[PDB]
Write a protein that binds this DNA or RNA. Structure first.
Lengths: 343, 220, 46, 131, 101
RNA sequence: AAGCUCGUAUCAGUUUUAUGA
RNA sequence: CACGGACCAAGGAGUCUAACGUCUAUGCGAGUGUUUGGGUGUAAAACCCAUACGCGUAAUGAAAGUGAACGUAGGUUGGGGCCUCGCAAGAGGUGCACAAUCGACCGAUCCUGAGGAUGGAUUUGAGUAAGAGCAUAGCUGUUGGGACCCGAAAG
């Protein structure tokens, strides 16, 4: 059994009701999988682009031939136009056809394993209930009551945007909704004149079990995205392949998440799917290393930085003092002279 | 239940849940059987320490979690060559589950809260230990209780127990032995268990050499 | 009441002392061994 | 010579991070064998079948050993009987995991094995068929 | 846990790092002691974390307990640090009893 | 380049003795 | 020798795809592969899935067939490791993958001829030793596509 999660009301008060953790939040948080799945999935909603098949071939040029004291690039015929006697059919030429004309049949969409794709979303959900991971990702979540944040089911029934934003402001997502709206900037590229004019930060996800006007209530407040628990998009959950979006769950959604994914007790609802096993027992190493156990079967410690044994070469013959650490007889040799000896 | 009130996220309902567990433990007519209920009680008390972070209230909480072996089956009935009569029969089921909880938990405790459970298991070994009974002698309590210490936590012929908790019991049972206040007690049979661990091969060296230095090297 | 040392840090002091008293005794029995070694080297050079 | 793992699974990097510590501090040649084995690629970590674990426990005086597969433990439908033994591995397949638990024994991770056997007492390291 | 928090922000984004031309990394999470960021010198990766800050002239020492991993609303417990230097360093010491040096 | 045994007595643009045309 | 260079700006050349591999990573694993499709969707995204099919899971042959335990799926020798003794140095035991040696089962041999029984003669094998694949992605090779770019006498 898990700790358990308190559900807050629309006034931002802790109701006596508590919900068990769905055990999806005990999935392996895998940054490498989320990255290598996101990059493939972000390619899918993408259109084709190609240069025209006729472009560059809509010229009637002819190569002038050998020994004409001029470069052998195919030149346009005719006369008295300016375009006559100049280069066509060439990647280097002006008005010429580009090297490797981009064709439509490029691999636009990416095939992914269905199980790997499911792993990624489970990891992405697991990272939403960490609080430090959410803070690192962005999301001003300092003044929010608990993580993972679960609001009462009456949040779904809200029709008017004014009341719906008042629910979030009472909860504590006020700062995150002020991060967005203040972060509205012009696109820095040619994206301005390609219908990608404005760019802003991502706000909270609002996950509901079933809609009673919540999808429409929040579709105007900037940054706020909603998702039905049955779906739960990876592109929403881990935006830019960065883990841990600030997710406001609802009471009914949080209970349904047990059914949707599965645990030890409940089945799965996805055909022949189980949540993946950890290849470690504990996600932290230092409890294992700084144990009573391991530190008992271990040889004594060093200094973390060696004391420098012989740093510079002092020479004997000169420097009297080092000539006494080598050969203690040199004291006796000096006292009796010994080199100065009579026969 | 109490597993939702001792493992709450609120401080006041966990303190009030402890006080309703004090009344629930002095209501002895309902705690008659069902081992796994006691296991769930120690898992709820495990979380009930796990939400306490500050040092003074976690020491007060460790002292009263040890004291829960004192309110539950206080010594006053003080049985005479009475084998296990409603103060000693059910008590052992309240002990084993605790160690079972720690036998389940020694992976899942991080490097910052593990001092709370070293100190907790110090207080609880001192408290069961203090409730052999009010005197340190009750003989079928000694061999049945020592069978339901020997057969779970210093097994040391089974790798299922985590090797840090017997070496911690070796580190604590001498000073917490003589917190009971040179007398003669059933100590040596306890020490015979450790001699059994030195007699037991097919183990790791740490249990074999760390008790063989730490426990036997004491001049007391 | 009053605050107490953590039962990892309590162990630390104990195991440090165990190693330190060993190390000091090992060091002290090496100064004497090197002194005796010095005397052997002196008479060999003679 | 191989220095670091090519893997990007950070949990495998945590095991390397653990077993590099136990490689130099224990000075027992068990840990050096495991830490070398973690660096190996996916073709060079072949899956040890549950049948090869059963064959390995027929070994005389190996009734109370904790068998350690650095690769993956996989299920075999052909065999019926399986001893009560502690098996340590990276990946237990759902079928194999169920087979060991129902037989009586445990299926444990490599860090659990690092706790229970730091120097590596009373163990056996199996390898899958490469050729 | 926290090792998993660290590795995911060591690389794979701590979205408040400044890469200086010196190759140095600076966490601007207002609650860190060293302005630089490293393992258990930045306040997200570590679970036990102390810091001195100032809101007014009043210099508080904030403190983060792993008890409060559930609730980020009241993470940093804070204590005023008199005003005289000598008694304040002594005030500091008592709070830091039985921590990392 | 990688994997496998080994870390050796595995050898060497060398000298020497030994034994033939 | 010779071919290129008056100077300056901008343009300008190993690309994309299919077929078949290499190695590495990831998922699962005797299985594996959602995306032809259907359901659903805040809509070319994401999220679910029926029946099939693809490749692999049990081999020995030429028309006709048969079928893998004398077995801790072997006897020995080694053989990473581990255990006992020893302060060590060593010795002994158990020995993974793998290698060497002696063989067996199965099919196929040279005969014996009760349509081919039966016993002997021997070897043989991408044979069984007791499964390692499938899919995605990256790195890259091979060949075809205009195929690194430009340049020829043509029908």
């Amino acid at each position: 059994s898990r700790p358990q999660v308190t559900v807050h009301s629309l006034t931002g008060e802790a109701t006596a009701n508590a919900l068990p953790l769905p055990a999806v939040f005990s999935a392996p948080i895998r940054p490498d999988i989320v990255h290598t799945v996101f990059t493939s999935v972000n390619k899918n909603k993408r259109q084709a682009y190609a240069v025209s098949e006729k472009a560059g071939h809509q010229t009637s040029a002819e190569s002038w031939g050998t020994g004409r004291a001029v470069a052998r690039i195919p030149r346009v015929g005719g006369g008295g136009t300016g375009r006559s006697g100049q280069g066509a059919f060439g990647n280097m030429c002006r008005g010429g056809r580009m090297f490797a004309p981009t064709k439509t049949w490029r691999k636009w969409n990416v095939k992914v394993n269905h199980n790997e794709k499911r792993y990624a979303t489970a990891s992405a959900i697991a990272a939403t209930a960490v609080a430090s991971l959410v803070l690192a990702r962005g999301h001003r979540v300092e003044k929010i009551p608990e993580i993972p944040l679960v609001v009462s089911t009456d949040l779904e029934s809200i029709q008017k945007t004014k009341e719906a934003v008042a629910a979030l402001k009472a909860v504590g997502a006020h700062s995150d909704l002020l991060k967005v709206l203040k972060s509205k900037k012009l696109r820095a590229g040619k994206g301005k004149y390609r219908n990608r004019r404005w760019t802003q930060r991502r706000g909270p996800l609002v996950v509901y079990a079933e809609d009673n006007g919540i999808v429409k209530a929040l579709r105007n407040v900037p940054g706020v995205e909603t998702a039905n628990v049955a779906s739960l998009n990876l592109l929403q959950l881990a935006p830019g392949a960065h883990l841990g979006r600030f997710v406001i769950w609802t009471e009914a959604a949080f209970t349904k998440l047990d059914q949707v994914w599965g645990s030890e007790t409940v089945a799965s609802s996805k055909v022949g799917y189980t949540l993946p096993s950890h290849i470690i027992s504990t996600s932290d190493v230092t409890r294992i290393i700084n144990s009573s156990e391991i530190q008992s079967a271990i040889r004594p410690a060093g200094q973390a930085t060696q004391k420098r044994t012989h740093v510079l070469k002092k020479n004997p013959l000169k420097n009297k003092q080092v000539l006494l650490r080598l050969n203690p007889y040199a004291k006796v040799f000096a006292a009796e002279k010994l080199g100065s000896k009579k026969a | 239940n109490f597993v939702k009130q001792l493992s709450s996220n609120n401080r006041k309902t966990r303190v009030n849940a402890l006080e309703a567990l004090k009344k629930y433990l002095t209501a002895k007519q309902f705690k008659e059987n069902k081992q796994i209920e006691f296991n769930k009680l120690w898992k709820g008390l495990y979380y009930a320490m796990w939400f306490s972070d500050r040092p003074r209230p976690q020491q007060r909480l460790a002292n009263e979690l040890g004291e829960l072996h004192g309110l539950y089956f206080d010594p006053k009935d003080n049985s005479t060559a009475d084998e296990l009569t409603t103060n000693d029969k059910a008590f052992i089921k309240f002990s084993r589950g605790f160690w079972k909880v720690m036998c389940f938990e020694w992976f899942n405790i991080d490097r910052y809260r593990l001092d709370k459970y070293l100190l907790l298991i110090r207080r609880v070994l001192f408290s069961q230990l203090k409730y052999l009974q009010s005197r340190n002698w009750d003989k079928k309590l000694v061999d049945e209780y020592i069978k339901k210490v020997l057969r779970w936590l210093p097994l040391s012929g089974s790798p299922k127990v985590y090797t840090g908790i017997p070496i911690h019991i070796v580190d604590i049972l001498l000073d917490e032995w003589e917190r009971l206040l040179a007398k003669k007690t059933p100590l040596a049979d306890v020490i015979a268990i450790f001699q059994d661990i030195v007699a037991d091969y097919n183990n790791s060296k740490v249990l074999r050499e760390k008790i063989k230095e730490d426990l036997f090297s004491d001049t007391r | 009441e009053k605050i107490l040392t953590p039962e990892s840090q309590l162990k630390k002091s104990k195991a440090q002392q165990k190693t330190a008293e060993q190390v000091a005794a090992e060091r002290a029995a090496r100064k004497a061994a090197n002194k005796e070694k010095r005397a052997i080297i002196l008479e060999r050079n003679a | 010579h191989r220095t670091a793992p090519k893997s990007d699974n950070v949990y495998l990097k945590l095991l390397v991070k653990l077993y590099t510590f136990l490689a130099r501090r224990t000075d027992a040649p068990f840990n050096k064998v495991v830490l070398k084995a973690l660096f190996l690629s996916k073709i060079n970590r072949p899956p040890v079948s549950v049948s090869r674990i059963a064959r390995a426990l027929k070994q005389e005086g190996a009734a109370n050993k904790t068998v350690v597969v650095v690769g993956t433990v996989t299920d075999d439908a052909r065999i019926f009987e399986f001893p009560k033994t502690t098996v340590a591995a990276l990946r237990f397949t759902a079928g194999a995991r169920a087979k060991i638990v129902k037989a009586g024994g445990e299926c444990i991770t490599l860090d659990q094995l690092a706790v229970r056997a730091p120097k590596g007492q009373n163990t056996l390291i199996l390898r899958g068929p490469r050729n | 846990s926290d090792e998993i928090v660290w590795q995911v922000i060591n690389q794979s984004f701590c979205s408040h790092r400044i890469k200086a031309p010196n190759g140095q990394n600076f966490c601007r999470n207002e609650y860190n002691v060293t302005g630089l960021c490293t393992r258990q010198s930045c306040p997200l990766a570590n679970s036990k974390y102390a810091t001195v800050k100032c809101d007014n002239g009043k210099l508080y020492l904030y403190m983060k307990t792993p008890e409060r991993a559930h609730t980020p609303a009241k993470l940093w417990e804070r204590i005023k640090l008199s005003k005289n230097y000598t008694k304040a360093l002594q005030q500091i010491d008592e709070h830091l009893l039985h921590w990392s040096k």
